[PDB]
Design an enzyme around this catalytic site. Structure first.
Site, short mmCIF file in Angstrom:
data_model
loop_
_atom_site.label_atom_id
_atom_site.label_comp_id
_atom_site.label_asym_id
_atom_site.label_seq_id
_atom_site.Cartn_x
_atom_site.Cartn_y
_atom_site.Cartn_z
N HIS B 42 0.77 -1.21 0.00
CA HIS B 42 0.06 0.04 0.04
C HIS B 42 0.94 1.10 -0.11
CE1 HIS B 42 0.11 0.25 4.45
NE2 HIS B 42 -0.11 1.75 4.37
N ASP B 88 -0.49 -7.40 1.95
CA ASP B 88 0.11 -6.01 2.08
C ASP B 88 1.79 -6.10 2.57
OD1 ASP B 88 0.32 -3.17 1.81
OD2 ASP B 88 -0.43 -2.58 4.07
N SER B 185 3.75 2.39 8.74
CA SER B 185 3.50 1.55 7.43
C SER B 185 4.50 1.14 6.72
CB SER B 185 2.50 2.17 6.50
OG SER B 185 1.32 2.25 7.23
N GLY B 186 4.70 -0.33 6.45
CA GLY B 186 5.94 -0.99 5.87
C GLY B 186 7.05 -1.20 6.75
C1 LIG Z 1 -4.67 7.98 10.65
C2 LIG Z 1 -4.64 6.28 10.34
N1 LIG Z 1 -3.41 5.93 10.60
N2 LIG Z 1 -3.38 4.62 10.18
C3 LIG Z 1 -2.72 3.65 10.39
C4 LIG Z 1 -1.42 3.28 9.60
C5 LIG Z 1 -0.67 2.46 9.79
C6 LIG Z 1 -0.53 1.82 11.23
C7 LIG Z 1 -1.69 2.18 12.23
C8 LIG Z 1 -1.83 1.58 13.55
N3 LIG Z 1 -0.78 0.80 14.09
N4 LIG Z 1 -1.62 0.35 15.29
C9 LIG Z 1 -2.56 1.29 15.50
O1 LIG Z 1 -3.14 1.53 16.62
N5 LIG Z 1 -2.83 2.05 14.24
C10 LIG Z 1 -2.49 3.11 11.73
C11 LIG Z 1 -4.66 4.37 9.54
C12 LIG Z 1 -5.29 5.67 9.48
C13 LIG Z 1 -6.59 5.74 8.74
C14 LIG Z 1 -7.28 4.29 8.85
N6 LIG Z 1 -6.46 3.24 8.10
C15 LIG Z 1 -6.99 2.00 7.60
C16 LIG Z 1 -7.95 1.34 8.12
C17 LIG Z 1 -8.43 0.25 7.83
C18 LIG Z 1 -8.03 -0.17 6.45
C19 LIG Z 1 -8.64 -1.54 5.65
C20 LIG Z 1 -8.56 -2.70 6.48
C21 LIG Z 1 -8.92 -3.71 5.79
C22 LIG Z 1 -9.65 -3.85 4.76
C23 LIG Z 1 -9.52 -2.67 4.01
C24 LIG Z 1 -9.17 -1.27 4.47
C25 LIG Z 1 -9.33 -0.26 3.75
N7 LIG Z 1 -10.48 0.32 3.29
C26 LIG Z 1 -11.59 0.45 4.53
C27 LIG Z 1 -11.50 1.77 4.70
C28 LIG Z 1 -11.19 2.47 3.45
C29 LIG Z 1 -10.68 1.23 2.37
C30 LIG Z 1 -6.87 0.31 5.70
C31 LIG Z 1 -6.38 1.68 6.50
C32 LIG Z 1 -5.08 3.07 8.75
O2 LIG Z 1 -4.32 2.25 9.02
#
Ligand SMILES: Cc1nn(-c2cccc(-c3n[nH]c(=O)[nH]3)c2)c2c1CCN(c1ccc(-c3ccccc3CN3CCCC3)cc1)C2=O
Ligand code: NA
Ligand code: NA
Lengths: 52, 234
Positions: B42, B88, B185-186
């Site tokens: 991603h 991912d 991330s990553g």
């Molecule tokens: C601000 C922010 N940071 N962040 C992040 C980044 C890195 C680490 C942590 C972390 N590690 N530990 C902890 O507590 N957080 C947090 C995120 C956000 C926003 C939401 N998001 C997210 C939420 C949900 C999904 C998803 C999950 C499963 C299927 C499809 C989808 C994707 N679809 C569903 C939604 C649309 C498409 C993708 C992205 C994140 O990951």
């Protein structure tokens, strides 16, 4: 118990072969004479912090 | 990372930082060898062109020991989709080999079964990165680390709004307000076994950061070892 008993006394990888403990190391390490410890083959072996 | 501690000299040498055209860090990575970086698939959508910074601990100050590496080959997992966030994972082959020194060293790749029975069963792993320090925030200029408990697979799925596939795992706290965040991330999730740090996860996603009853979601590195091995031959 073998590998379930303190990783078979292995430094790293523990396998069971012919009902016995077999140890192995990641790349950049050689298995010691005792067949348990893992010796780095050169500087900066994987997974070691560079604290010194 | 929300909470946690700064990575002190030589503590997180396997950390890689993906930098955009504007020279700002956007995703993390794990150093696997002199030519290979492990990251999230991603992350490859976050920037059109990107380089890999290593040995960086503080982005504000040029350390000297820091090195920028260009990417030759991007090996992305074909099964990845933003709809599920499954698979991912990506491997980056660099143009030039990394020079291992203080703060620059690779993490070990474990063997599949041993990683599952011996690494995944430890109480905790360590996540690290230059990501957000608060859910709503700027990218950190300092490399941080955080010890995160391994979370029970059932609790993990109950905690989530989304499907937690077999290529994913939870780590974090249900109450303690410390976790990875956007920009981590990553990056690495490593598990220490007898003073040797093995790469166990890739920071993947989470429902916000450090939220109570929620956890960090990681790509299960054990599920892609042969794919990883195959990628390092190309
Ligand atoms: C601000 C922010 N940071 N962040 C992040 C980044 C890195 C680490 C942590 C972390 N590690 N530990 C902890 O507590 N957080 C947090 C995120 C956000 C926003 C939401 N998001 C997210 C939420 C949900 C999904 C998803 C999950 C499963 C299927 C499809 C989808 C994707 N679809 C569903 C939604 C649309 C498409 C993708 C992205 C994140 O990951
Ligand atoms: Na720096
Ligand atoms: Na939490």
């Amino acid at each position: 118990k073998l590998c379930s008993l303190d990783n078979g006394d292995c430094d790293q990888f523990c396998h069971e072969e012919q009902n016995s403990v077999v140890c192995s190391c990641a790349r950049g390490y050689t298995l010691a004479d005792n067949g348990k410890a893992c010796i780095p083959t050169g500087p900066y072996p994987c997974g070691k912090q560079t604290l010194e | 990372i929300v909470g946690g501690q700064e990575c002190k000299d030589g503590e997180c040498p396997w950390q890689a930082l993906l930098i955009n055209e504007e020279n700002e860090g956007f995703c993390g990575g794990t150093i696997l060898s002199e030519f290979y970086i492990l990251t999230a698939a991603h992350c490859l959508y976050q920037a059109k062109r990107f380089k890999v910074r290593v040995g960086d601990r503080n982005t504000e100050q040029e350390e000297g020991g820091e090195a920028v590496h260009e990417v030759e080959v991007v090996i992305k997992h074909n099964r990845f989709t933003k709809e599920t966030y499954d698979f991912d994972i990506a491997v980056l082959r660099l143009k030039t080999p990394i020079t291992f020194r203080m703060n620059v060293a690779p993490a070990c790749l474990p063997e599949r079964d041993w990683a599952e029975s011996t690494l995944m069963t430890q109480k905790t792993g360590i996540v690290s990165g230059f990501g957000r320090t608060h859910e709503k925030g700027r990218q950190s200029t300092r490399l941080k680390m955080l010890e995160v408990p391994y979370v029970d697979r059932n609790s993990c799925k109950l905690s989530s709004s989304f499907i937690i596939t077999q290529n994913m795992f939870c780590a974090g706290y249900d109450t303690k307000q410390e976790d990875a965040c956007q920009g981590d991330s990553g990056g690495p999730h490593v598990t220490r076994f007898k003073d040797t740090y093995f790469v166990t996860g890739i920071v993947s996603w989470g429902e916000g950061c450090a939220r109570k009853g929620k956890y960090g979601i990681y790509t299960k590195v054990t599920a892609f070892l042969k794919w990883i091995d195959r990628s390092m031959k190309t």
